[PDB]
Symmetry: C5
Subunit: 307 residues, 5 copies
C-alpha cells in the first residue's frame, strides 16, 4: 500500500448557502508519497507545473486522483505543481476553490453554530493509504472576530478513517475499504448584526403594540390595533426580504409569529372588554390589568421557548 | 447486442426550480459490460482516469456515450475512471452534478408532492442493451426529515424499457428501438415553514378582518376596512417576493384572493347595512348577525375548495 | 452544390427574457448529406462520438459549420455524433441548449402572443444548400396546457430561403447568397395566473376606491382617499417586484395608472363638492351622483382602451 | 508594415449595466490582409474553421491576435473561419459576444444619452497597421424604435488613430505606436416607461399631497401629513427596487427628494399657521394662501432645477 | 537567483462585494527576465501568442507560474504573448480579469475608506526573485470623481517583500522564503448618492416624527406615533432592499435604530404625560417642553456617536 500524506491550507471560508447547505472553501492542497527513484536534471528535484503535469502522466507517471466526497460540482483548480524528487518522493501542490456540502442546522438562526467539513478519498484506489493529514487553518483567531460574520472556535480537528463500500462487483473478495480524511472546523455566527437591526426593532414594535391598551376609547383601541397588525406584516417582510426562506422557522421568524399572536390576542381582549359585561359596561379593570399583564404574559411565555 | 448494466448513486437532490420545472442531482454513475479480453500489466485490472481515458479511445477502445435524456444543459462530470479487467469486463465510473427536468405540478403548493426522475439512454447505439439498473438512493430515510425541505417517501423505483423512434433515415429496416433506463424518486415537500410563517399569519389577518363589524359607527366600520384592504396587499407582497411567480395560482395564492374577497365583501355589507333600511335605519340586526356569520360563511366556502 | 438536409428536435422552450427579448431552446439538431463513398469497418455504418469527431476532421473529413444566426452567445452542445455511411451519406447529430433572440412585443402583456424563431445558416459556405428542413416540435398540444405557462398554437412552420449579403470582398462576382432555414413556433401566454392574482385584486381595490363617496363627512372623504392613494402605490409595487421592468407600459401597468387617476380624480371631486357652492353648501347632489357615476365613467373609459 | 482592413457587424446591443458602466455587443468581426501567395486545393480559396484554424498557425501561418481594449473579460467567440486566398489575401471571420466598458453618465436618468464604443488594437504588433474600418450597424433605424429600449440616432462613426505607449522596455527606439480603431454608436434612452409608470404617478402623489391644506381642522392637517410622509417612502421604495442604485442622484431621485421636502415643508407651515398668531388664532389667511401657493412654489423651484 | 521584473497595468476596479470582501480587477500584467541567448528568425525578437506559448514550454522553455495570492478563483486571462529576445530577455504580457479578496471594513458605511490590494508570488520557485515592481494605475485622478462611485486618493504603492513559509517538507534546509509583490490602491466611497437619497430623507422623517407633540389631544398624539412607527419600518425596508446585509451595523443602520428609538421614546413620553399627574392632569408643561427638547436630546446623543 502506497503511503500518501496530505496537507491542506485553508485561506478563506465564505458564501454559506443556507438552502443548499453548502459553503465555499478557497485554499491549497498538498500530497506527498514515495515512489521509484528517478533521474532528474542534475540531481535537484524537478518542478513541473500545469499543462506539463499531464505530459509526465502520458509517459507513465502515476498521479492518483483524489476526490472531495462532499464537493458540490467540480472545483476550480488554479495553479498546480508536481515536485519530483530523485529519491522517489513526489509532492503535488494545487490551489483550489470549491463548494462543499454538509448537514447544517439553522433552527437557532442568529445564535446558531456550524462546522465546515471536508472529506477526502482516493477516487479509484483502496490499495493506497492516506498516511497522515495535517491541515493549517491559519486564519485569524484573535484579530477581527467581532467584525467578521463567523467565529472559528478552535483549530481544526483531523481524522483519517476507513470507509466500507458494499455494493461493488463480484470479483472483489476483501479490497473494498478506502482511506478517508475528514477535516472539521467549528464556527459560530456573529449575532451582532441580527440583534441590532432585526431583533431589537421587532422588540420595540412588539412592546409598543401593548401600549394599545393605554387608549381611552374602545374605538381607538380596536382601530389602532389594525394599524399595528399592518406594521408586523411590513416588518415580517423587511425581515424575509433580507434573510431568506429556510425550510424551517427561525428564532426571528418565531418572534415574527409572536408579534402576530400578541396583536391578535390584543384584538380579542379589546373586543372582549367591550361586550363582556352586561348592560354595556366597558370592564375598565381588564384594560388596566392587561395594560401591564399583556407585556408580562408575553415575557412569561417567552421563557418556555428555551425549555 | 452488448449487455450493459448501470448503477446510479444519488448523493443529493436540491435546487428545485419551480418556473423551469428542474432540479439538481449530484452523484455517481457506473456502467459495466464485457468486451474482448485484454493484456494488462501483470494480471491485475488496470485503472485509467480523466485525461488518460481519452487516450484508450484514440487507440480504439469502445466506450459508448450515455446521455441523460431529461438533463438541462451539459452536466458537470467530476472525476471519471475506467476499470479494465483482463477477462473482458469494463467498468466506467464517473461523478456528476446535473440539472434535470420533469413535468412538475405545483397547484397544491405547500402540500404538493413530486417525483424526481432520471432518464438514461445510449446516444448512438440501439444494438446495445441496458441489462439491469441498480440505483442506490442512500440518503436519510429516518434521520432528518422534519428538518429537511423534502421528504423522500421510499426507495427509488427502476424500469428498463424500449423507446421507439420513428423519424429516422431510410436505411433502418428495424433497428429503431433504444434501451432506456427510467429512475423515479418520490418526495413530498416539508410544509412546516409555510404553515407557521405564511398560512398562519394570513389566517390571523383574515380572521381579524372580520372584527370590523364589532365597531359601533358606520364611519368606523368602512374607514377601517380600507386599512384592512392595504394589509392584505402588503401581505400578498410579503408572500410573493419570497415565494415567486408560478404560472398557476397556488393554495396560498387562493387564500390571498380569499382575503381580498372577504374584505371586499365586508365593504359591501358595511355599506349595505347603512343604506338598506328606509329613513336611515342602520339595520343593527345585520351588523350583529354577520359579526359571527361572516366568519362562518368563509369557513363554509373553504370546505368546498377541497371538493 | 452540396445537398444538406437538417432535422431539428425541440424538447423544451423556456426562460423567456422580456427585457433582452430572448428565450431558451433545448433539443437536438441533425444534418445529413452525401459525400464520397468510404471504407468502413465491415460494411456497417460507423459511429463516431464527441472527441473522436475532431480526429476525422484532422484526417480530412469535411464537416461544415452551421451557425444559429439569432443565437445569443455560444450554445451548450452536449453529446455529438457522426454517422458515416459506406455509400457516402454522413449524418451529424448533436444535442444543444442555446439562447435565441427575436423581436418580441409585450405591450398586451397578460394576453400577448409571440413566436419563437430559429435561424440556421452555413457559416462559411454559399456553394452548399440546405435541402429540406423537418422539425419535430413534439411537446404536448392537448395534455397540459391550462397548467403550462405557454400554449403552442400549432406545429412549427419552416421556411428555407436565400439571404443576399452585399458587403463582401472584391473577388466575388455572383456567389454571395447563403441558404437559411427559418423555423417559427407561435405561442400564446397563459393569462390565468395574472388574472386571478394581479388583475382581479386591482379591480377590487379600484372598485372599493369608489366607495369613498359613501362616507358622510367631507373630512372622512378626503382623509380616507389618502389611504387609498397609498394602497395603489403598495399594489403598484407588488406588481412590479414580481413582473419586472419592461421598456413599455403593459396592460397591468395601465390599470395601475388608472388606479392612480381614479383616486386622484376622486380627490378633486371630493374637494370640488365642498367649495363649489356659495355660502358653504356641500353639493350633495354630486357626491350621490358620482357615487355610481364614478364607477361608470371608469367602465366607459376602459372600453375606449381597446379602440 | 502589414495592411489589415477590418469590418465589424453589430447585430445586437443590450444589457447595459449602470453600476459597472458596461453593455453587451453581439456581432461578427472580419479582418483581411495580403501575405505570401500560396498553393491551395485546385485554385479556389480554402475555408478553415474552428479547431482547424489553430492547425495552420502551428505550421507557421501568421494570424495576428486582435484585442478589444475596452472589453471586460475574455469575450465569447462562436464560429470562426479562415479564408485563405491563393494570391496572398487572408480573411479571418468570427462571431463574438462580449461585454465592453465606457464612461457612461446617468445623471439625467430617464432622458440620458450614451454612446457605446468599441476599441480594437493589435495585441503585440506595432509594425502592422489597420488600413480601413467599415462597420455595419444594420439594426432598424425606422422600424421599431418607440417599442425598443434604446434609440440609435445615426449610423456609427469610425476613427483609426495612433496611440502612444510610453512605459515599455529599454530596447524600443521608435516603435511604440499602435494602430487603434474606435467605433462610436450614439443612443438615447426611451423615456416612455419611466414617464407613465414612475414620473406621472409621482406627480399625482406630489400634487395630491398639497390637498392637505383643504382640510378644515388643524388635527386633520397634521395627522394626514404623516400618512403622506409614509406614502412618499413607499413610492421611493417602489422606484428603487425596480431601477437600482446608481452612484449619483438621478432626475427621478431628485423628484423623490422634492416629495419629501414638499411634505416636510407642509408639516412646518401647518404647524406654523397654528401657533404663529397670538391668543390661538389659526391664521386662516395662510392655509388658504398656500392652498394654491404651495403648488406654485414647487413649480417655481422645479424650473430652476434646469438652470 | 533569476531576476524577474514585473509591470502591472490596472484598467478598471469595480464590483465591490461587501459580504464576500472581494473586488474585480481588469488589466494587464507584464514580467521580464533574462535567460539563455537564443537564435531567432532573422535577428529580431520573436512574438509568440496564445496557443503557441504552450508549444515553446513543451520544447523546454522555462516560464514560471506566478500566482495571485489573494485571488478568489482562477482569473480570466485574455490574450497573452511571449517576447523572446535574441540576447536572452523574455517578456511575458497578459490581459486578465480577476476577483481579489482583502480585509475590508464597512462600519462607517457611506463615509468608509478601503484599499484594493494585489498579492503576487511565484507559485513554485523560491530561488527566483522579483526584481522591481512598477504598477501604472492610469485611471483618472482629476477628471470624473464626483461622478464615479469611488475616489482614488493617489497612485498605487508597491511593496516587494519576503514571505517565510514554515510547514514545508523535511529536505529544505533554508530555501523556504518566497518573493511577494503587494500592490495597494487607496479609495474612498462617493457618499453623494447615499446622502441625498438615504441620509437626508431619514433626517426629515426622524425630524417630522418629533412634530407629533404639536398635536393637541392625547388620542391624537399616541395614534399618530403608530403611523410614525410604521413609517420607520417602511423606510428601514427601503434602505435594506437596496443596500444589502452586512455582518455589522453601518452608519445608516444606526440612524435607522435611532429612528425607532426616538419614536419609541416618544410613545413613552406621550403616555407618561397623560397618567403622570394626579387626578387626570395632562401635564401640559411636558408636552410643550419636549416639543423642542426631543429634537435636542436626539442631537445631543448623536454627537456622542462620533466619540
Amino acid at each position: 500500500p502506497v503511503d500518501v500524506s496530505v496537507s491542506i491550507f485553508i485561506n478563506k471560508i465564505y458564501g454559506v448557502n443556507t438552502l443548499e447547505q453548502t459553503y465555499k472553501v478557497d485554499g491549497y492542497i498538498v500530497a506527498q508519497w514515495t515512489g521509484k527513484p528517478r533521474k532528474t536534471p542534475g540531481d535537484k528535484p524537478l518542478i513541473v507545473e500545469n499543462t506539463q503535469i499531464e505530459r509526465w502522466i502520458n509517459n507513465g507517471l502515476w498521479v492518483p486522483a483524489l476526490e472531495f466526497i462532499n464537493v458540490v460540482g467540480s472545483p476550480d483548480t488554479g495553479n498546480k505543481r508536481l515536485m519530483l524528487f530523485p529519491d522517489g518522493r513526489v509532492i503535488y501542490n494545487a490551489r483550489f476553490l470549491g463548494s462543499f456540502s454538509n448537514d447544517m442546522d439553522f433552527r437557532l438562526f442568529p445564535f446558531d453554530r456550524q462546522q465546515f467539513v471536508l472529506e477526502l478519498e482516493p477516487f479509484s484506489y483502496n490499495n493506497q493509504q492516506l498516511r497522515f493529514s495535517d491541515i493549517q487553518v491559519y486564519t485569524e483567531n484573535i484579530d477581527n472576530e467581532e467584525i467578521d460574520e463567523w467565529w472559528i472556535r478552535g483549530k481544526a480537528s483531523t481524522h483519517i478513517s476507513d470507509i466500507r463500500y458494499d455494493h461493488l462487483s463480484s470479483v472483489q473478495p476483501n479490497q473494498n475499504e478506502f482511506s478517508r480524511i475528514t477535516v472539521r472546523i467549528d464556527a459560530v455566527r456573529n449575532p451582532s448584526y441580527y440583534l441590532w437591526s432585526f431583533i431589537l426593532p421587532l422588540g420595540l414594535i412588539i412592546a409598543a403594540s401593548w401600549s394599545v391598551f393605554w387608549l381611552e376609547s374602545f374605538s381607538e383601541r380596536l382601530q389602532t390595533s389594525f394599524t399595528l397588525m399592518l406594521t408586523v406584516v411590513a416588518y415580517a417582510f423587511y425581515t424575509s426580504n433580507i434573510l431568506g426562506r429556510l425550510p424551517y422557522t427561525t428564532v426571528i421568524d418565531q418572534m415574527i409569529i409572536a408579534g402576530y399572536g400578541s396583536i391578535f390576542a390584543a384584538i380579542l381582549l379589546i373586543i372582549f372588554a367591550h361586550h363582556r359585561q352586561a348592560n354595556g359596561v366597558e370592564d375598565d379593570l381588564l384594560i388596566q390589568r392587561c395594560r401591564l399583564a399583556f407585556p408580562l404574559g408575553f415575557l412569561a411565555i417567552g421563557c418556555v421557548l428555551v425549555i
